[PDB]
């Protein structure tokens, strides 16, 4: 079925299903992705009241739900049909031998291992010799294998647990990775259009393996930082949404070393998102577009002493030549 859903009249960011997002303030609505023919159903739920005695600041937040393809607008209301999740069976289920049907459930892994995936491949994709493709090719389309390959790279960025932290459901795992990668707006839109979670995981791995360089979105070619310098100082990952004194949301990716930037002014500590670090506005050395801030440790014992926080909207992932 389809739904008659209202439109958010002041939304800028595109919301991914399963992403919580503070908003710039001036029960299910629609958030379009204007290039302009797609969008996502967001849920404004927040009645949040923090408790600081006498002041209960009220923060508003939205969370993505279902994808859709817009049909027609009418002022704002939008009639839209929800795009389904295309869940596919195993690649070997078509050619699974009846004798090997019983020996298809594998015992669990002693989580710490790298040699376990060798026997995992030999067993799961054994009937590949019945087809015209090798064992390792089918692994490139195995959601469980793709998830571990993505999880391996994410552990190099964030130093957080590997258990319940990341969802096991591939359609949820795919949407989670989409909201964590430091990718531009058109890439998030391209991932939303993807129907199959396996394709979404394959492309998220492609983005990580190809789009290593992050550059200014305005002037295109101006390498700001690379994927190697990405690290996580905030316990909630390497890229978390912060709100400034006036209510502007900044999905700030923290990197060790950033280049080709100009500093505007002297370090300040007012409303610093990272306690104990003095922020200073950073701009592109070619087009003077705001890329982010530079944080310098006030005390000398802090580690790391200096790092950079780049806003996601000002970056453009590119593939080095």
């Amino acid at each position: 079925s389809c739904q008659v859903i209202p439109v958010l009249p002041q939304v800028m960011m595109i919301l991914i299903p399963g992403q919580t997002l503070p908003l710039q303030l001036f029960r299910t609505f629609a958030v379009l992705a204007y290039s302009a023919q797609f969008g996502t159903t967001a849920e404004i739920y927040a009645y949040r009241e923090e408790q600081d005695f006498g002041i209960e600041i009220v923060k508003v937040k939205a969370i993505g739900r279902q994808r859709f393809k817009v049909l027609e607008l009418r002022t704002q209301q939008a009639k839209v049909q929800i795009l389904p999740e295309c869940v596919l069976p195993s690649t070997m289920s078509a050619v699974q031998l009846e004798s090997l049907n019983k020996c298809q459930i594998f015992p669990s892994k002693p989580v710490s291992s790298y040699k376990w995936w060798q026997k995992y491949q030999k067993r799961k994709f054994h009937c590949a010799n019945l087809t015209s493709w090798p064992r390792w090719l089918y692994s490139l389309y195995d959601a469980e294998t793709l998830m571990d390959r993505i999880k391996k790279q994410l552990r190099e960025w964030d130093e957080n647990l590997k258990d319940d932290s990341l969802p096991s459901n591939p359609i949820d795992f795919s949407y989670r990775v989409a909201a964590c990668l430091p990718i531009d707006d058109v890439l998030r839109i391209q991932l939303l259009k993807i129907g199959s979670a396996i394709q979404r995981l394959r492309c998220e791995l492609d983005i990580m393996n190809k789009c290593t360089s992050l550059c200014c979105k305005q002037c295109q070619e101006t390498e700001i930082t690379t994927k190697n310098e990405i690290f996580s100082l905030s316990l909630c990952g390497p890229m978390a949404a912060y709100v400034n004194p006036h209510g502007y949301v900044h999905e700030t990716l923290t990197v060790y070393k950033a280049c080709n930037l100009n500093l505007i002014g002297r370090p300040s500590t007012e409303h610093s998102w990272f306690p104990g670090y003095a922020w200073t506005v950073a701009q592109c050395k070619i087009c003077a577009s705001h890329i982010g801030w530079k944080f310098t440790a006030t005390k000398k014992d802090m580690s790391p002493q200096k790092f950079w926080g780049l806003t996601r909207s000002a970056l453009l992932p590119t593939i080095p030549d």
């Binding site: 400034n244 006036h246 922020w279 506005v281 801030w293």
Partner: peptide, 26 residues
């Protein structure tokens, strides 16, 4: 003074010097 950018917090000492920065946000 209050001639700072509301989006990033860049401190400019002139009224015009901040209006030029406002273009670098859109």
């Amino acid at each position: 003074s209050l001639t700072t950018c509301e989006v990033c917090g860049a401190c400019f000492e002139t009224r015009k010097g901040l209006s030029s920065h406002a273009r670098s946000h859109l």
